[PDB]
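Hey all, quick one. A colleague (J.T.) asked me to put the calcium ion job into the tracker so the inputs and the structure tokens live in one place instead of scattered across chat threads. No bug as far as I know, just bookkeeping. Sequence used:
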Amino acid sequence: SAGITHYIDAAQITIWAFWLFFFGLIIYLRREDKREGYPLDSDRTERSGGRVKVVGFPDLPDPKTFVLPHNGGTVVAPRVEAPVAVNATPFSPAPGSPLVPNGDPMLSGFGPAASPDRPKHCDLTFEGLPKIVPMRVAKEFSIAEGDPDPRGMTVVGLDGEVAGTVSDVWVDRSEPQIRYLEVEVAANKKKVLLPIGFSRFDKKARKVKVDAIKAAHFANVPTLSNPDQVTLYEEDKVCAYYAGGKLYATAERAGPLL
Amino acid sequence: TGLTDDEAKEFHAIFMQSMYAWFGLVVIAHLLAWLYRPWL
Amino acid sequence: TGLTDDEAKEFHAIFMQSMYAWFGLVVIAHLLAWLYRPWL
Amino acid sequence: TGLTDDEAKEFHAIFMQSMYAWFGLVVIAHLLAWLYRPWL
Amino acid sequence: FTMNANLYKIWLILDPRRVLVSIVAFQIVLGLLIHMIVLSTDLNWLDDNIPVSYQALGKK
Amino acid sequence: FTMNANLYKIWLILDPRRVLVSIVAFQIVLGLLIHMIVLSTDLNWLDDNIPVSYQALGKK
Amino acid sequence: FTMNANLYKIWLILDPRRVLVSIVAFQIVLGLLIHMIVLSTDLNWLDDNIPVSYQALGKK
Amino acid sequence: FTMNANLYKIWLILDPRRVLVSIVAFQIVLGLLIHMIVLSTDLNWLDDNIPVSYQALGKK
Amino acid sequence: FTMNANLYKIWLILDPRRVLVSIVAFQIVLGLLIHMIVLSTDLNWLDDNIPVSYQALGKK
Amino acid sequence: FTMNANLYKIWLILDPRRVLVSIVAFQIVLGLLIHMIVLSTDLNWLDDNIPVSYQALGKK
Amino acid sequence: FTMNANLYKIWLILDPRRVLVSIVAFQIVLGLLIHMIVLSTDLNWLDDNIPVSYQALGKK
Amino acid sequence: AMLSFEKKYRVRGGTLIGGDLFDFWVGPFYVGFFGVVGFCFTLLGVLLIVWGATIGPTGPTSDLQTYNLWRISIAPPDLSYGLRMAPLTEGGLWQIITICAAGAFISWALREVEICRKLGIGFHVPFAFSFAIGAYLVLVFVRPLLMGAWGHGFPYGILSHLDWVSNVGYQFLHFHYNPAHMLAISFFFTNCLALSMHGSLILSVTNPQKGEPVKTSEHENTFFRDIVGYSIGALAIHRLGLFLALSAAFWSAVCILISGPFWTRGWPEWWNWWLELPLW
Amino acid sequence: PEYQNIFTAVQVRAPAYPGVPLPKGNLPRIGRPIFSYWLGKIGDAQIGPIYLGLTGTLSIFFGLVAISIIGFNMLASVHWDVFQFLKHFFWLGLEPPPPQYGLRIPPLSEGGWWLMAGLFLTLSILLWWVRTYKRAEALGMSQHLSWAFAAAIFFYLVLGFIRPVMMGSWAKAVPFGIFPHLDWTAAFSIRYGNLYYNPFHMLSIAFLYGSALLFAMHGATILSVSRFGGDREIDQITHRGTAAERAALFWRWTMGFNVTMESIHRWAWWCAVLTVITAGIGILLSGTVVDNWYLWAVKHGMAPAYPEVVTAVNPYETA
Ligand code: BCL
Ligand code: BCL
Ligand code: BCL
Ligand code: BCL
Ligand code: BCL
Ligand code: BCL
Ligand SMILES: CC[C@H]1c2cc3[nH]c4c(c3C)C(=O)[C@H](C(=O)OC)c4c3nc(cc4[nH]c(cc(n2)[C@@H]1C)c(C(C)=O)c4C)[C@@H](C)[C@@H]3CCC(=O)OC/C=C(\C)CCC[C@H](C)CCC[C@H](C)CCCC(C)C
Ligand SMILES: CC(C)=CCC/C(C)=C/CC/C(C)=C/CC/C(C)=C/CC/C(C)=C/CC/C(C)=C/CC/C(C)=C/CC/C(C)=C/CC1=C(C)C(=O)c2ccccc2C1=O
Ligand SMILES: COC(C)(C)C/C=C/C(C)=C/C=C/C(C)=C/C=C/C(C)=C/C=C/C=C(C)/C=C/C=C(C)/C=C/C=C(C)/C=C/CC(C)(C)OC
Ligand SMILES: COC(C)(C)C/C=C/C(C)=C/C=C/C(C)=C/C=C/C(C)=C/C=C\C=C(C)\C=C\C=C(C)\C=C\C=C(C)\C=C\CC(C)(C)OC
Ligand SMILES: [Ca+2]
Ligand SMILES: [Ca+2]
Ligand SMILES: [Ca+2]
Ligand SMILES: [Ca+2]
Ligand SMILES: [Fe+3]
């Protein structure tokens, strides 16, 4: 790696042989690292790097072609995606600064609650049935011999107050497991789905603790179109709503601690 | 971008008086050093 | 930010006084020290 | 790309010309060396 | 209070809750970082002059 | 304690559990962070001299 | 204030709080960096000589 | 400024902020680099010759 | 400049700013890299010989 | 240069800026890679031969 | 080279640029690979016999 | 400059300390309280590391002082000082610089913390990163402390810190016999065995044979069920991995810690307890 | 069961999934799937069925010979005294053929069994590689796994095929022993001047480390985003989702840049597969091309310089 060389040998004739392949592979990768996102949006802080450049060190790659399975469309990577929308205003005219959520941040659909418009279709299994469905349809699925049953437990909330009770849980045909919980909100008496990721258990009191949002927030949760299957579009917009709680369910959360 | 021409003027001044501030402060202590103990 | 000229102004003073209350509280620190033991 | 041969040559002018501004200032560099500290 | 002149306007760009507690943390460490750097060679008052030979005199 | 005159206002922008236990933690660390260094330099009273008869002479 | 004349226009580009504190950072890292590099080789004024030769009278 | 007076139309593709600070940060990284590299081998104005080689003379 | 005449066509395949700055980079590297390699084992000019007279002599 | 006529069509399969910059790279890299691989073994022009050690002939 | 007639058919299975550049690559490597292997034992044309050693006699 | 889907995420809040003040984004990075902190350590240390290359083992004019990235080295002070600050020149740099490492590593984690706090994501990453930092807190703090000398640390030299690994290693003879060390190793290997396996499968289902669709989790399971029988599971691997990774470091931390403070004899010998068992 | 997506709180079960339909020629899966509540509390609970064709059966039988041979000799040295066998297990091991045989086929005693059990373990892997290749195309899958497994195999053979044979002595081959093989790598290094200075060996570590690093990030990130369905990478690679939609922003804001849900897995691959790549090489060079990597380093001005506070004489030159 020295600037000047006075020594030559086979050992070193192969080392550089690697770095070249390396410097090349790292680029190969970078190219791929841009099949989702780029180009960038603004110029808040002029692309930083040993060598600036227009759009990174490596020019964007060629659109790959993804043939979804039967009864499916087609995806291209990368792809020219139409600009999204921001339901928030700039906390400051200075670039980089954050964007304050308008109205109730719990549903402003921004940041934590913000979710992209995923395909308004539904994921399926190998054969063609909706991958993720409620046990009210999964005639084969049963609770593991021994493990306590969730169906019937009362879903508590952040503040502690009860928000509703589980009426059913959504299992996954493709990958045997519990992914959602058909929760029955008390307030709106509606039926919203609850994601495992946020679903906590207290087998002692037959509950499904949730620190995401308050019991009251469970009310206006992104409803589902068909109660016999969850759409990818909504599915992602579902558990995203809970995320908001992770940062909006309480002014204290977003507020500093020190 | 962040401001307009006016505000740009307003700040350029107020701060400019502050930047030197440090600076002057600098020399007095950079000098005091030179005077008391010479480097080189 | 989050404030206006009138507002922030009344607290600029209060703050400032204190930093010096300490900038001084500390001057006395160096003070008593150099007296006892001297450095350089 | 994203421009016709009109502003493609205009830029080329500035580009090319200045490009020599270095080939020259860089030759005076080396030459200035060949006279001071030579090599081979 | 020289800079006190027009320095008042700065509180608009600088938040109290933050800049204040922020300084607290930075200040503190800086101090211990000092003793630390100083207590090293300059003068290790602990064992340096008097009356620090408790071990050399006691152990023996 | 001059500043402590108007400092009352402190709690208006800070919560209770905030700096309450905050400093508490900073005391324990510095707290033992200090016996520490102090126990090393000047008087390793932990073991260096007196009393060393019963332990030392007791070993002989 | 030679260039500072027409340099007023610079503010649109460089924001206030953004590069305002960014600078505060460099200085600080620098400030130490110097005292540090200096206090090392040149004149380790700290513990090398006077005043009072407290490091030549105590240690010795 | 034979060339530059003619090439001014170049800020048409390089927005100011982008290369203004690009060049800005690069100065320091280089400033400290050379400044330091120089301090490294070329000469050490700190103790390399004058004024008094204190560590050796100043102390006493 | 002779080449420029018809070589203006190349600016239809390569971006003006991309090729512009992209090289601004390869320049700093190819540059910085040279003084280094020539300052590594080639005739160091910094402190290789004169004027290192005070470098190593003036000190003592 | 035979079939140079038939060889023009090539652009119809490969793109202009694809094999273009691809050359600049493979070349430009090969450049340093060469001077280097040669810089050592054969005629280490930098520090093998004359001019005579600037350091020894120049200094002494 | 009579085969040339029925050879054309080959392109009907192998893609234009698929095996096109696949070769531009196999050669590139194989090339540098050879000089490399040759430069080792076979014959270090660069620093072996002639004119090597001039980096010592009149060189230094 | 933001990604096609960045703007809608740059929310305000979720800060631990003095957030609103530094609550902003500089390019593709985030600052906040801890943001500035780390930096204040970066240059304050990165430069010192350079100052070391500048100065050198004895002096800047010495023949030892070099700039070859390989030969560069920043060794700690002698074991004489123990828990005392040695002259910046004779070990001081390392000592101070190291204090900057913790300030960079830890803060970097803390920074990640609230960063996740904004995306409402899980605090897995940081908690995971903790171990790495923890392992460091052992090779410079924990171990040296129970050894009574900050000089027990490792030199900050690209190749210099390898010798420190060779000596301390042989200091217990054949360092290959260390229980915790072995165990840990297994993990590092398992981990790599996991990556080479995970990453591979993904690319093998989303980019199948020519003229083939994107496979589903239906295949993944069968695939490893036909080569070895069982399939851990989708996220399962993402769990397993995370485990191995951390476990690899954890057991390692133990590995070096036990070496010295909890054992002075030769590791190869430690295994004797198994031999001197009243069963053979 | 602490839920940070650590342990599946509540499990459910469905009819044993007998894998997906395979092509013509591929024998039907075998084995009645099993269920484990505990195991399943970690990930998947169902077990099997498993495939076993020609290559498979030919493999499971092949390598199973080597293992036996090894474990056999091991229990042989202990004079078939299991007591002392389970005692010195770690130490016990099938040693390679003595240098007094070069590459020639030694007697079962002096190194024979090793070689035999070796070829049976060499092909056992080579064969197993094909076994995997047959499980990929049978499912329309690619060969990313074979490519990797290949790379690993590469370094595997470097320890016997390409290097030892290139040295002309079965002595330079790792032995069949838990502990004694640790000594092999222990001796090898000593024999070749300290692998710390061996270039490739370092590059390979960067991977043994990098590897661990990435998965620590990925494995984690996916979990942290497991809330927004970040585990289902497949449908994420096809149509980007919210999981991968924040999952990157994190890294981006933290380290500046980032890659895509798919992309990363590609890095991981090359960061792991390249591990052994720099492995077989670093060892393929040692013994043959280089003999003392320490002097080799300093030869190229690599080895760092240390003051001389300690030094020893040399009775050789003196006497
Ligand atoms: C080395 C030879 C001398 C010596 C020579 C010098 C010289 C020469 C100088 C110093 C300077 C300094 N020395 Mg000294 N010094 C010595 C020995 C010491 C010892 C010691 C233990 O022995 C110590 C502890 C110090 C300590 C210090 C620092 C107080 C000071 C560094 C200031 C700075 O860079 O801020 C970094 C800057 C910032 C953080 C921010 C920028 C400042 C602006 C103007 C104010 C902030 C505005 C903000 C936006 C408003 C909000 C307010 C709050 C932040 C909320 N010196 C020896 C004896 N020292 C410098 C100095 O004191 O200048 C006055 C200086 O020039
Ligand atoms: C080396 C030569 C001398 C010496 C010279 C000095 C000098 C010179 C100084 C000290 C200073 C200090 N020395 Mg001393 N010191 C020596 C030996 C010692 C020994 C010892 C065991 O031998 C010890 C334990 C100490 C200990 C100390 C500390 C008490 C003090 C550091 C204060 C600080 O950093 O605040 C850090 C700051 C903060 C946490 C926050 C900022 C302060 C503000 C004004 C108050 C907070 C406001 C807040 C927003 C409101 C909420 C209130 C609560 C936080 C909730 N010294 C020797 C004998 N020492 C410093 C000092 O005494 O300052 C008074 C100092 O300047
Ligand atoms: C033997 C004793 C040691 C020593 C031991 C300690 C210890 C121990 C502590 C400090 C602390 C501090 N020391 Mg001291 N310090 C020494 C020598 C110095 C020198 C010096 C030039 O020699 C300087 C500049 C400083 C500066 C400082 C401050 C950075 C810090 C108080 C911070 C603050 O409130 O800033 C507010 C400042 C400003 C807004 C800038 C304006 C500065 C103006 C120009 C006034 C400077 C006058 C100066 C204080 C008087 C020096 C007297 C000279 C000997 C004649 N020390 C000697 C070598 N110092 C404390 C600390 O850093 O806590 C965080 C601490 O705990
Ligand atoms: C070894 C023998 C000589 C020597 C021989 C040479 C030679 C020969 C050369 C240098 C050159 C340089 N040397 Mg010298 N040099 C010596 C010792 C030194 C020492 C020292 C401490 O001892 C130092 C610090 C330097 C420092 C320097 C730099 C000033 C300069 C870097 C050129 C370069 O590559 O830019 C890299 C370039 C770029 C990043 C940009 C490209 C330039 C273009 C044309 C302008 C940009 C246009 C832009 C788009 C418009 C917008 C404007 C702004 C960018 C916003 N030399 C010794 C004495 N030196 C070079 C030079 O000065 O060239 C003029 C050179 O060719
Ligand atoms: C003679 C030498 C001995 C030996 C002596 C030792 C000694 C002595 C030690 C080890 C240690 C280790 N050895 Mg051992 N070891 C030997 C042979 C081996 C072999 C082998 C195949 O032969 C293997 C696989 C290992 C494996 C291992 C690891 C398990 C362990 C390192 C653990 C770790 O994860 O730290 C994880 C990581 C860290 C501590 C670093 C922290 C990372 C920080 C936070 C991030 C840095 C960021 C950076 C600043 C930014 C970079 C970006 C730039 C800006 C661009 N050893 C031989 C037999 N080994 C060490 C150990 O046990 O550690 C616990 C140890 O102390
Ligand atoms: C774990 C047990 C030992 C140890 C044993 C080993 C062994 C054994 C080896 C290394 C190797 C390396 N070690 Mg180590 N190393 C230790 C602790 C550290 C620490 C630390 C903060 O504690 C750091 C930063 C490093 C750094 C490094 C890298 C220079 C090098 C590449 C490793 C790698 O690829 O990881 C995977 C990760 C990445 C590729 C990404 C980031 C790492 C980057 C590339 C390294 C940057 C370090 C930089 C030079 C530090 C200064 C930064 C300034 C801002 C310029 N080691 C402990 C003490 N280390 C290998 C080597 O080749 O050394 C020469 C090697 O074989
Ligand atoms: C069990 C934990 C595993 C792990 C996990 C892990 N690492 C992580 C993370 C996680 C989860 C991050 O989130 C973080 C990251 O990459 O975030 C984007 C990171 C990271 N892991 C890294 C490195 C790393 N991890 C390692 C290991 C591991 N990482 C384990 C396998 C190793 C080794 C030795 O094998 C290395 C080298 C970094 C790339 C990055 C953290 C970067 C960071 O926070 O840097 C902060 C500081 C600076 C940029 C400035 C440092 C300058 C200081 C002032 C001086 C310090 C001196 C230093 C000690 C000298 C080193 C010299 C050596 C060359 C000898
Ligand atoms: C001698 C000489 C001439 C010198 C010249 C010197 C010159 C010119 C200098 C100027 C240039 C300068 C100063 C450059 C500075 C650049 C700097 C400081 C960069 C700092 C950033 C930094 C420290 C980065 C560390 C990155 C490292 C080491 C990462 C290790 C892990 C790794 C392999 C990451 C790459 C792949 C990525 C991005 C993984 C992260 C990642 C993971 C882990 C997911 O799981 C995931 C899941 C879903 C979507 C995305 C992701 C994702 O991106
Ligand atoms: C009704 O409204 C009510 C009244 C309720 C509102 C109430 C408001 C209240 C109660 C407000 C309270 C406000 C307060 C308490 C404000 C306090 C402000 C303070 C204390 C500010 C202090 C500032 C201190 C500063 C900025 C110190 C700066 C020090 C610097 C920059 C030091 C640099 C030091 C260096 C570089 C040292 C180097 C040392 C060496 C050289 C050794 O390093 C190597
Ligand atoms: C009695 O046993 C029973 C029945 C109870 C079963 C129990 C068995 C047990 C307990 C077995 C335990 C085995 C263990 C613990 C084995 C451990 C092995 C270890 C640690 C091995 C470590 C490393 C091994 C390596 C690196 C092996 C490399 C082998 C190679 C490279 C072989 C190459 C062979 C070649 C090239 C053959 C070529 C064919 C010929 C020679 C003809 O070419 C000329
Ligand atoms: Ca002095
Ligand atoms: Ca001088
Ligand atoms: Ca020459
Ligand atoms: Ca052996
Ligand atoms: Fe994954």
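Adding what we noticed when we looked at it: Residues C 23, 26-27, 30, 33-34, 39; E 27, 30-31, 34-35, 38, 42 surround bacteriochlorophyll A (ligand 3) (CB under 6 Å). Residues 1-40 of chain D form a domain with the Single alpha-helices involved in coiled-coils or other helix-helix interfaces fold (CATH 1.20.5.250).
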